[PDB]
Ligand binder design. Structure first.
Ligand code: ZN
Ligand code: ZN
Lengths: 99, 1332
DNA sequence: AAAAAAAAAAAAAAAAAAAAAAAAAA
DNA sequence: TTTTTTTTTTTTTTTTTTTTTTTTTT
C-alpha cells in the first residue's frame, strides 16, 4: 500500500517523486499515455501530465477551485513550452506561434 | 487556442525585436552585496527587477507605479516574471558562423555554396582565403587561397580583385549568390546530365534552393551577426550552502563577452592583422562551444576535466528537455495496492480502502470543511483530518457522492487497462475490484498491484464517466465480442444450471411459472435440474420496435427455468435452452447487446454474476483424487505399444529398417496408442453416469467435476485433462526434436525421475520463451504505436467510389473465416448485386451491421466490394465512411476520434499470446476452374497446362464453398462445368518431377540434339531401354552449351505442326540435367510426357518491416512473350517482349533455381517466374495496392487465428496505409517536383489535383512500400523526429525548411503539452479553427 | 580490347545501453 | 597576491565510406 496527494517535488524537475521510502507518487508510463490517447479523453491526459505532475497559475487556481468547491481548470499553457521556445530563440532560430 | 507552430531562421532585425538590451559587460552579481551589476548577465533594466514590484534603486515599490520606470536605476517596476521572459543580445563586431549548419552532415552551407567542408572549415578558422567577385582574373569565383598565393594574387592583382577570409568572407559569398539563375542552370544540368551521382547532388541542391526560395529566409542569416542571449532566470546562479556560486552557460557567456570586448578594444587600437585574426578565431570558437561544445574538435572542459553543458546538451540526450520531461512521469494524487474481488459490488462501481480516500482527497475535504466552517484556516483543517475526527467521514462520503476515479494496471497493453469507476468506501486495506473486468485487465489475484488516479476538472470527470466508464466499455476494440464474458467460476454454476439429470426430485411434473420453480427448488422438494414442462413468457420485438408478449409451455430443467427470470424481456428462450458454454454465454451477451442495447445488458450481466455465484456456492462443486479415472485399457494399450516398439527395434536389429525409419515408426505408433488412450478416457469420462431412469438403466452425460469443468470451458482444455488422466504425450528436447520415448505415466499416478526431468526441460524452455516473448512483444508494440501515432479521423466521407473486395477465405480446406465476420460494420463501396441479377440488394454507400450481414448471408452473397481506409481520399486524415463502424461502439465512427493508436494497440496486445500429393474433395458441387488452360491426355483424363490453375467446387446454391490449388499436369477424373459427387477423388497428381507434356501430337524428331557433346547416353541397369540425358552447361563443352535441346513436333508429312492460335511449331526445349525419354520416329498423343526433369511473432514483425525474403519468388515485371537472353554472365538473362509495347527490359536470374516458365510463353505482368517466398514491394509495383494489402491482412489474420485470437482487419488496413505514405515521382509533368524526387503521397496528391483543376496537367507517381521504422523516420512532423533519437539534423532541416508544423500528429501535442486534436480537444480546436 | 561508371560488400568509427600540488594570469 | 587550470599520483549495432569487380560503350 502507498499513495500520495501533495508531497515534495524533485530537485531536477517539478514532478512527484516515486517509491515508498521517500513519499513519492505512482509512475505514469508512456503506454498509459498511449491508452489515454486511445480513449477520446483529452483534458484528463493534459491535466494529468501537466498539473498533476506544474503551471503556477494552473496548480494555484486548481487549489482555489477545489477549496472553493469548484471543479474546473484553466488549461492555459504549461510554461515548459515557453522554456523550450525561448531556448530555441536563443539559438539562431525564428520559431513562433501562429494564428 | 492557436494553430500550427511555425519554425524559421532568426534574423538580426528579429533578434533585436526579441531582445531588449545588450549585455556589454560580463559581470553577474556584486558578490559583496547581493545586488546585480549594470548591463551584466544579471541586469535589472535589461531584464527586470529581481523582486516583485521593486525598483533596484527602490524608488517605486508601489503597485500604483507599475510599469513606469525609475530614473535612479532605470528599472521598470514589474513582477520578476519579466526576467524569466526577456531575452537579450550581444553585438558582434565580426560575423560569426552558425556551427549547426557547419556540421549538420550534410552541411547546409557547404553544399549550398557547392563547396567541400574541409576547405570551408579551413577558410572559417582564418588559415585560407576565398575569391569574392573574381571576375576577369586567373582565379575562379569559388576558389580559395592561402598566404603565399594570397601574396601572389596581391602581386598580380593588387588591383580591383578582392579575396577575403573567414566568416565575413562567407557572409559576403552568401550575399553575392543568385537563386533563380542557380535554379535555372541546375535544372538544365539535371535535364541533360546523366551521371547518377551528379543527378543526386543536383536534386538535393535544387530541392534546398527552391525550398529556401519558398522560404522568406536569407542566406546571410545562416551567418550570425548579433547573438541572442538567454533570460537570466533560465540560467540561474544557485548559491550552494556556503560562499560559492556554482550554470556553465553563465561562464560561457562571460567568456564570449570578454572575447568580444577585447576584440572591440583591439579593433579600436587597430591591432595587426594576425592579432585580430586570432581574436576572431577565438571568438568563433567561443561561440561554437557555447552553441555546441564537442561538435568541433577537442572540447573545452568544466570542473576538472569533465565536459561542460551547452545549448545542444540542454536540448539533446536523455537529459534533453524533450526526453527529460516529456516521457513517463510520476503523478500526485495517485495510489497503488493489491486487489481483491468484492463480488457484491457492481461493474458500474469499485471499491477503495478508506485510508486511500482520506489521503487522496485532502484539498477536496478542506474545501468542504471551510464551506461548512468547521475550521476556517487550512492548517487547522489539516490537523483535523490527520487526527481523523468524526465529521470528516461525512465530508468524504459527500465528495465521493459523485466523483469517479481511474483504476490502472502496470503492463497497460490494451486500453481497458485504464478504466473509470465509482469508488465505494470499504474497510480493510485492499481494493475490491469487480470480477468480470479483471478478465479485461487479465489481472489474476496472484498479488497484482493496481494503481489509482483521480481526475480534477469537471471536464475530466465528464470524460471518465462518459468515455472510460465500464458501462461505456463492454466490448473489445479489437472486435465486437463482449470483453465482459464471465471467466471461470460463475460459468461453472451456469453450466450446472442448464444440465439435466434424468431422474431426481422435481422430475416429471409441470409448473405454471419460474417463480414456483425457485420456490420448490429452495424448498428442497425438487432437484436443481430435471426435465419438466413449465409455462414461460417471452417478449419479442419483431414489430417496428414494439413488444409482443406470448406464453407457452416448454420442457426445461429446474435450474434453467430459475435462470429464465434473470433474462430481460426482449430475448427468446431457445438461447437459454442449451448447455450454456463459454462461447454460448458469450453469444448470449452478444444477442442481448445487439437487440436490447446497453443498460439491459449491464443489468443482465450483474444479475448473471450474482445468481451464478450463489448457485455455484449451492453446487458444492469440488474435486478429488477419485474424480479422475484411469481406464484399464491404458495398461493394455501401453503393453501393446511396448510390444510394437520392441518388434520394430528388433526389425531394425534385423536390418530391414533404418534407425531414422525405426524411430519415426516408433513415434507414430506411440502417438496412435496415445490417441487410443485419449479416446478411451474421454469415453470413460463424458458418459460415465449410468443409472436407473426411474426404470432399469440409462447412460447420460457425466457429472464428474472434471468433465463439468472441461466441457463447461471454465478452464483448461482436452489436452490438460488428457495430461491429468492419461499420458501427457510426447515431450521434445532442448534441440526441439521430439523424443522417442513418450511420457508413459500420467499425473494421477506417480511420474518417474526421467519423465519429470524431461517435462522440466520442456516447461523451463516454455518459461524462458515466455519471458523473451514478453520483451519482444513489448518492443514490437512500441514500434507499432510510434509508427501510427499520427493518423486521425478528420472527415466523414471522402466521396470515393473505390474500395477493396472481400470474400471468405479457404487455404485449401475448410473455410477459415466467413464473409459475415470480415464484412460486418463496414460501409459498402459498391452496391450488392444478388444473383437475381438486376437487383440492387443494398445501397451503394451504406453501413453493414448484423441484420444486413445476415440478409446477405441468407442471400448467399459471396464477394462484396466494400470501402476501405487505404482507398480513402482524405487529405491529411481518413474519411469515416472509409473506416466504417467504430468497434467498442454501436454507431458509425465519430468525427475527430483518432484510430491509429487504438489500431496499433489492439493488434499488438496479443503479441504476448502469440508463439515465438493428391486431394479428396469432400463437398458435392459442380466444377469450376480459374487460370484454366487444360487438355485431354492420351488416357482421356483432363490434365492442366497452366501452373496457376485453381479448382473451385461451385456448391448447389452457387457459391464457391471449396477451393484448392491445382499443381501442373494434375490428374482429373472430370472436367470444368461438370458435376462431381461429394467424396469423389478427382484432384490427384504426381508432385515430384516436372512434366514435359505435349500440347499437340506428331512425330518427335531430334531437332537440335547432338549426341556426345550436348547429351549423354546413360543406360538403365534394371530394364535395358535407355534414355538420352541432357547435361548442364558447365559439365559439357562450351560448344554444346549453345546447342539447345529442342523437341519439335511434326506431322506425318514431317512438316511442323501449327499450334492453334499461333503459327510457331510445337518446339519443347529442355533444361540442363534432363533425361530425354522418347527417341526419333515415335508419334505422341496430346498431354504426353517427353522427358523426366529431376513462423511466429518475428515473421509478423518482418512482414511489417517487409524485409526481402532469402530467395524471393521472382515475378514478371511486364507482360509479353518471354525469351532467353545472354548466358552465364553471372546470371542468365530473360527478356519479355510485349506484343505491342516495348521489349528491351531484361532481368537477371541465378539459373540454379527451379524455373517455372518456358521460353515461348506469353504472360501478363506480375506472373511468378521462380517459386518460393513472395516479397510485398513487387506485388505493389506489379499487382497494385489492393493485392499486397490483401496478402498482408490474410497472412497476419492466419497467424493470429492459428494462435486463436481474432482482430478486425481494419487495424491492419490503417497500419498498412501509414506504412506506404511515401512515394516516388515518375515524371515532373507540369509540376515542379523533380522526376526521381521522393515525396509524401498526400502532398503530391493535393498538388497535382489542384494543378489539374486548372488547365495544367498533373504528374506521374509511384507509391513506395517503406518499412515501418523507415516510415517513422520519414515523417514531416519534425517535432516528433526531434524527440526521436536526434535534434541536430531534425532542427537544421526544420529551420532551413521553415516548416509550419501542423498540430496534426499526436505525440507533438503532448510534447508541447497542448491538447490532443483527437477527442474532445479536436472539437474544441475546431472552435479555435473557427475563431481564426 | 580497353577505359570508365555503377554496384555492392567489407571495415571501422561513432552512438547507445579523482584529489592534490605547482605554475600562470589577472 | 589570489584563483583557476593542468598534470601526476566497454561492447554491440548501424551507417558511412572506399575499394574492387562487373557491365557497358567506344
Ligand atoms: Zn530606478
Ligand atoms: Zn476516403
Amino acid at each position: 500500500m502507498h499513495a500520495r496527494s501533495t508531497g515534495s517535488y524533485s530537485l531536477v524537475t517539478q514532478q512527484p517523486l516515486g517509491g515508498k521510502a521517500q513519499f513519492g507518487g505512482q509512475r505514469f508510463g508512456e503506454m498509459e499515455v498511449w491508452a489515454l490517447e486511445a480513449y477520446g479523453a483529452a483534458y484528463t491526459l493534459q491535466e494529468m501530465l501537466t498539473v498533476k505532475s506544474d503551471d503556477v497559475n494552473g496548480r494555484t487556481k486548481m487549489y482555489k477551485n477545489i477549496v472553493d468547491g469548484n471543479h474546473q481548470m484553466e488549461p492555459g499553457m504549461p510554461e515548459s513550452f515557453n522554456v523550450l521556445l525561448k531556448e530555441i530563440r536563443s539559438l539562431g532560430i525564428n520559431i513562433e506561434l501562429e494564428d | 487556442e492557436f494553430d500550427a507552430i511555425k519554425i524559421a531562421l532568426a534574423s538580426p532585425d528579429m533578434i533585436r525585436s526579441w531582445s531588449f538590451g545588450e549585455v556589454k559587460k560580463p559581470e553577474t552579481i556584486n558578490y559583496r552585496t547581493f545586488k546585480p551589476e549594470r548591463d551584466g548577465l544579471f541586469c535589472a533594466r535589461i531584464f527586470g527587477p529581481v523582486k516583485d514590484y521593486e525598483c533596484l534603486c527602490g524608488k517605486y515599490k508601489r503597485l500604483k507605479h507599475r510599469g513606469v520606470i525609475c530614473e535612479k536605476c532605470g528599472v521598470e517596476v514589474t513582477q520578476t516574471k519579466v526576467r524569466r521572459e526577456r531575452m537579450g543580445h550581444i553585438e558582434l563586431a565580426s560575423p560569426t558562423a552558425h556551427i549547426w549548419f557547419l556540421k549538420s552532415l550534410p552541411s547546409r552551407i557547404g553544399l549550398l555554396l557547392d563547396m567541400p567542408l574541409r576547405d570551408i572549415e579551413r577558410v572559417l578558422y582564418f588559415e585560407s582565403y576565398v575569391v569574392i567577385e573574381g571576375g576577369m582574373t586567373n582565379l575562379e569565383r569559388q576558389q580559395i587561397l592561402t598566404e603565399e598565393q594570397y601574396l601572389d594574387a596581391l602581386e598580380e592583382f593588387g588591383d580591383e580583385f578582392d579575396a577575403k577570409m573567414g566568416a565575413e568572407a562567407i557572409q559576403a559569398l552568401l550575399k553575392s549568390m543568385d537563386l533563380e539563375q542557380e535554379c535555372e542552370q541546375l535544372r538544365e544540368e539535371l535535364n541533360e546530365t546523366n551521371s547518377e551521382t551528379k543527378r543526386k547532388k543536383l536534386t538535393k541542391r535544387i530541392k534546398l534552393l527552391e525550398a529556401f526560395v519558398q522560404s522568406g529566409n536569407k542566406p546571410e542569416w545562416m551567418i550570425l551577426t548579433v547573438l541572442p542571449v538567454l533570460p537570466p532566470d533560465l540560467r540561474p546562479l544557485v548559491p550552494l550552502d556556503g560562499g560559492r556560486f556554482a550554470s556553465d552557460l553563465n561562464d560561457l557567456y562571460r567568456r564570449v563577452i570578454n572575447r568580444n570586448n577585447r576584440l572591440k578594444r583591439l579593433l579600436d587600437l587597430a591591432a595587426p592583422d594576425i592579432i585580430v585574426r586570432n581574436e576572431k578565431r577565438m571568438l568563433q570558437e567561443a561561440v561554437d562551444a557555447l552553441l555546441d561544445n564537442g561538435r568541433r574538435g577537442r572540447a573545452i572542459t568544466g570542473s576538472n576535466k569533465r565536459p561542460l553543458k551547452s545549448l545542444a546538451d540542454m536540448i539533446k540526450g536523455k537529459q534533453g528537455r524533450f526526453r527529460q520531461n516529456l516521457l513517463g512521469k510520476r503523478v500526485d494524487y495517485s495510489g497503488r495496492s493489491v486487489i481483491t474481488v468484492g463480488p457484491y459490488l457492481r461493474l458500474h462501481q469499485c471499491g477503495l480502502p478508506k485510508k486511500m480516500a482520506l489521503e487522496l482527497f485532502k484539498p477536496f475535504i478542506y474545501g468542504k470543511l471551510e464551506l461548512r466552517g468547521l475550521a476556517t484556516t487550512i492548517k487547522a483543517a489539516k490537523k483535523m483530518v490527520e487526527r481523523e475526527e468524526a465529521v470528516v467521514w461525512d465530508i468524504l462520503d459527500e465528495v465521493i457522492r459523485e466523483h469517479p476515479v481511474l483504476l490502472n494496471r502496470a503492463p497497460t497493453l490494451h486500453r481497458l487497462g485504464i478504466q473509470a469507476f465509482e469508488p465505494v468506501l470499504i474497510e480493510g486495506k485492499a481494493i475490491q475490484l469487480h470480477p468480470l473486468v479483471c478478465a479485461a485487465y487479465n489481472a489474476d489475484f496472484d498479488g497484482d498491484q493496481m494503481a489509482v488516479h483521480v481526475p480534477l476538472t469537471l471536464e475530466a470527470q465528464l470524460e471518465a464517466r462518459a468515455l472510460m466508464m465500464s458501462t461505456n466499455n463492454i466490448l473489445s476494440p479489437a472486435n465486437g465480442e463482449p470483453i465482459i464474458v464471465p471467466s471461470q467460476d460463475v460459468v461453472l454454476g451456469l453450466y450446472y444450471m442448464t444440465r439435466d439429470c434424468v431422474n431426481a426430485k422435481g422430475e416429471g411434473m409441470v409448473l405454471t411459472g419460474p417463480k414456483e420453480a425457485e420456490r420448490l427448488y429452495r424448498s428442497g422438494l425438487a432437484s436443481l435440474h430435471a426435465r419438466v414442462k413449465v409455462r414461460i413468457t417471452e417478449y419479442e420485438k419483431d414489430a417496428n420496435g414494439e413488444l409482443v408478449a406470448k406464453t407457452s409451455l416448454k420442457d426445461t430443467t429446474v435450474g434453467r427455468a430459475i435462470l429464465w427470470m434473470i433474462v430481460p424481456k426482449g430475448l427468446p428462450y431457445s438461447i437459454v435452452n442449451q448447455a450454456l458454454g463459454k462461447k454460448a454465454i458469450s453469444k448470449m451477451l452478444n444477442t442481448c447487446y445487439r437487440i436490447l442495447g446497453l443498460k439491459p445488458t449491464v443489468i443482465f450481466a450483474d444479475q448473471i454474476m450474482y445468481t451464478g455465484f450463489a448457485y455455484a456456492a449451492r453446487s458444492g462443486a469440488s474435486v478429488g483424487i477419485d474424480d479422475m479415472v484411469i481406464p484399464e485399457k491404458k495398461h493394455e494399450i501401453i503393453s501393446e505399444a511396448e510390444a510394437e516398439v520392441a518388434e520394430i527395434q528388433e526389425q531394425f536389429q534385423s536390418g530391414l529398417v533404418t534407425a531414422g525409419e525405426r524411430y519415426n515408426k516408433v513415434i507414430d505408433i506411440w502417438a496412435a496408442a496415445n490417441d487410443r488412450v485419449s479416446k478411451a478416457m474421454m469415453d470413460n469420462l463424458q458418459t460415465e453416469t449410468v443409472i436407473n431412469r426411474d426404470g432399469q438403466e440409462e447412460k447420460q452425460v457425466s457429472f464428474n467435476s472434471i468433465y463439468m469443468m472441461a466441457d463447461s470451458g471454465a478452464r483448461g482444455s482436452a489436452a490438460q485433462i488428457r495430461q491429468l488422466a492419461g499420458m501427457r504425450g510426447l515431450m521434445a528436447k532442448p534441440d526441439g526434436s521430439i523424443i522417442e520415448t513418450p511420457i508413459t505415466a500420467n499425473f494421477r499416478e506417480g511420474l518417474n525421475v526421467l519423465q519429470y526431468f524431461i517435462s522440466t526441460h520442456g516447461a523451463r524452455k516454455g518459461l524462458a520463451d515466455t519471458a523473451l516473448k514478453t520483451a519482444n512483444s513489448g518492443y514490437l508494440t512500441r514500434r507499432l504505436v510510434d509508427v501510427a501515432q499520427d493518423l486521425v479521423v478528420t472527415e466523414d466521407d471522402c466521396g470515393t467510389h473505390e474500395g477493396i473486395m472481400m470474400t471468405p477465405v479457404i487455404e485449401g480446406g475448410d473455410v477459415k473465416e466467413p464473409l459475415r465476420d470480415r464484412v460486418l460494420g463496414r460501409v459498402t463501396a459498391e452496391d450488392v448485386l444478388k444473383p437475381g441479377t438486376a437487383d440492387i440488394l443494398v445501397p451503394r454507400n451504406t453501413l453493414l451491421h448484423e441484420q444486413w450481414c445476415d440478409l446477405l448471408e441468407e442471400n448467399s452473397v459471396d464477394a462484396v466490394k466494400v470501402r476501405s481506409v487505404v482507398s480513402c481520399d482524405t487529405d491529411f486524415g481518413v474519411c469515416a465512411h472509409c473506416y466504417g463502424r467504430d468497434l467498442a461502439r454501436g454507431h458509425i465512427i465519430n468525427k475527430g476520434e483518432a484510430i491509429g493508436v487504438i489500431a496499433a494497440q489492439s493488434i499488438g496486445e496479443p503479441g504476448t499470446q502469440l508463439t515465438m500429393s493428391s486431394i479428396q474433395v469432400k463437398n458435392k458441387g459442380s466444377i469450376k476452374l480459374s487460370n484454366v488452360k487444360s487438355v485431354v491426355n492420351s488416357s482421356g483424363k483432363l490434365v492442366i497446362t497452366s501452373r496457376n490453375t485453381e479448382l473451385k467446387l461451385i456448391d448447389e446454391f452457387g457459391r464457391t464453398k471449396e477451393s484448392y490449388k491445382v499443381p501442373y499436369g494434375a490428374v482429373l477424373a472430370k472436367g470444368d462445368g461438370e458435376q462431381v459427387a461429394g467424396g469423389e477423388t478427382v484432384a490427384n497428381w504426381d508432385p515430384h518431377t516436372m512434366p514435359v507434356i505435349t500440347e499437340v501430337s506428331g512425330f518427335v524428331r531430334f531437332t537440335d540434339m547432338i549426341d556426345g557433346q550436348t547429351i549423354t547416353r546413360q543406360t538403365d541397369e534394371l530394364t535395358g531401354l535407355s534414355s538420352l540425358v541432357v547435361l548442364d552447361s558447365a559439365e559439357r563443352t562450351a560448344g554444346g552449351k549453345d546447342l539447345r535441346p529442342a523437341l519439335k513436333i511434326v506431322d506425318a508429312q514431317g512438316n511442323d505442326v501449327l499450334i492453334p492460335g499461333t503459327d510457331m511449331p510445337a518446339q519443347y526445349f529442355l533444361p540442363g540435367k534432363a533425361i530425354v525419354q522418347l527417341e526419333d520416329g515415335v508419334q505422341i498423343s496430346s498431354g504426353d510426357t517427353l522427358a523426366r526433369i529431376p513462423g511466429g511473432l518475428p515473421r509478423v514483425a518482418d512482414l511489417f518491416e517487409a524485409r526481402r525474403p532469402k530467395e524471393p519468388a521472382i515475378l514478371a515485371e511486364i507482360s509479353g512473350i518471354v525469351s532467353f537472353g545472354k548466358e552465364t554472365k553471372g546470371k542468365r538473362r530473360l527478356v519479355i517482349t510485349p506484343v505491342d509495347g516495348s521489349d528491351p527490359y531484361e532481368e537477371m536470374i541465378p539459373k540454379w533455381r527451379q524455373l517455372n516458365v518456358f521460353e515461348g510463353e506469353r504472360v501478363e505482368r506480375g506472373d511468378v517466374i521462380s517459386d518460393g517466398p513472395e516479397a510485398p514491394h513487387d506485388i505493389l509495383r506489379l499487382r497494385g495496392v489492393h493485392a499486397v494489402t490483401r496478402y498482408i491482412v490474410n497472412e497476419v489474420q492466419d497467424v493470429y487465428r492459428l494462435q486463436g485470437v481474432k482482430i478486425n482487419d481494419k487495424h491492419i488496413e490503417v497500419i498498412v496505409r501509414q506504412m506506404l505514405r511515401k512515394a516516388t515521382i515518375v515524371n515532373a509533368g507540369s509540376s515542379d517536383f523533380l522526376e526521381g524526387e521522393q515525396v509524401e503521397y498526400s502532398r503530391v496528391k493535393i498538388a497535382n489535383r489542384e494543378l489539374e483543376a486548372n488547365g495544367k496537367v498533373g504528374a506521374t507517381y509511384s507509391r513506395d512500400l517503406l518499412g515501418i521504422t523507415k516510415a517513422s523516420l520519414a515523417t514531416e512532423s519534425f517535432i516528433s523526429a526531434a524527440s526521436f533519437q536526434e535534434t541536430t539534423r531534425v532542427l537544421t532541416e526544420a529551420a532551413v525548411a521553415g516548416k509550419r508544423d501542423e498540430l496534426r500528429g499526436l505525440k507533438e501535442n503532448v510534447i508541447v503539452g497542448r491538447l490532443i486534436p483527437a477527442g474532445t480537444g479536436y472539437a474544441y480546436h475546431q472552435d479555435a479553427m473557427r475563431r481564426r
